Design a protein around this ligand. Structure first.
Ligand SMILES: N#Cc1c(Cl)ncnc1Nc1ccc2c(c1)CC(=O)N2
Ligand SMILES: N#Cc1c(Cl)ncnc1Nc1ccc2c(c1)CC(=O)N2
Ligand SMILES: [Cl-]
Ligand SMILES: [Cl-]
Ligand SMILES: [Cl-]
Ligand SMILES: [Cl-]
Lengths: 4, 124, 124, 4
């Protein structure tokens, strides 16, 4: 999971 | 927005769509390319091809279970492009590049046409 | 094999599937969550959820146009997860995390359950 | 395009  | 994103999600969805295709699960159309037939999902075809997007948004053609392609279309070229649609992988070879490029032009798959043009220009 | 790969292909397919959903194009099921209804593509639901994969591979349920979820399922939680399926983006907030996690457990969406557990553990 |  990432900060887009 | 303040969303988080799962990097591999799109790739995992496509892998599962390919698994469904391989098992002939919820496939809703057969693409006929001369003597050959290819089962697929209309939504995947539309999402990958300007030609299929046009065909399946048509009020009559959206309901067809069989689509016959132009007799000039090469079945191997179509097979390579159908695999690309479901995997992101293009099996581009010296022996198939002309057929793949012609099929991609017909199917309106701009990024494929682009790499074929570049690979051809490098060999001349 | 000796294939080349188009990095953005899977993301572009998913973006187009979401565009089709937004325009209600070739959607083939309605998911009912108490008073709310959500139109979707069976293949996308199956590709994202262990529960939908189970439902639409069933010889009777594969043909249903309406699927009613358990009354304990929160419609907002379902909406957030349906958006995630079509975009890779999860709108996870303090006010919805419990509903999202419970819905993801029910839908069998392991990666979502995982990030919810981690976000909850960090707040305790 | 890349070599996967
Ligand atoms: N399905 C869908 C779809 C939608 Cl909803 N919006 C916009 N394009 C869509 N698909 C589509 C249209 C044109 C082309 C491609 C895909 C690849 C390409 O080279 N040309
Ligand atoms: N459609 C399809 C499908 C196929 Cl073909 N093969 C394998 N899994 C499939 N989908 C599916 C099954 C289990 C789970 C998910 C997706 C996400 C998750 O957390 N659990
Ligand atoms: Cl027909
Ligand atoms: Cl393309
Ligand atoms: Cl029904
Ligand atoms: Cl997930």
């Amino acid at each position: 999971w990432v900060i887009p | 927005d303040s969303c988080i994103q799962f990097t591999r999600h799109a790739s995992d969805v496509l892998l599962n769509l390919n698994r469904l295709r391989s098992r002939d699960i919820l496939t809703d159309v057969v693409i006929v390319v001369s003597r050959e037939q290819f089962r697929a999902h209309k939504t995947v075809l539309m999402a990958c091809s300007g030609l299929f997007y046009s065909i399946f948004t048509d009020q009559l053609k959206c309901n067809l279970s069989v689509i016959n392609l132009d007799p000039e279309i090469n079945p191997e070229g179509f097979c390579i492009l159908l695999d690309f649609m479901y995997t992101s992988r293009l099996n581009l070879r010296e022996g198939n590049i002309m057929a793949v490029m012609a099929t991609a032009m017909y199917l309106q798959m701009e990024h494929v046409v682009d790499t074929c043009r570049k690979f051809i220009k490098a060999s001349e």
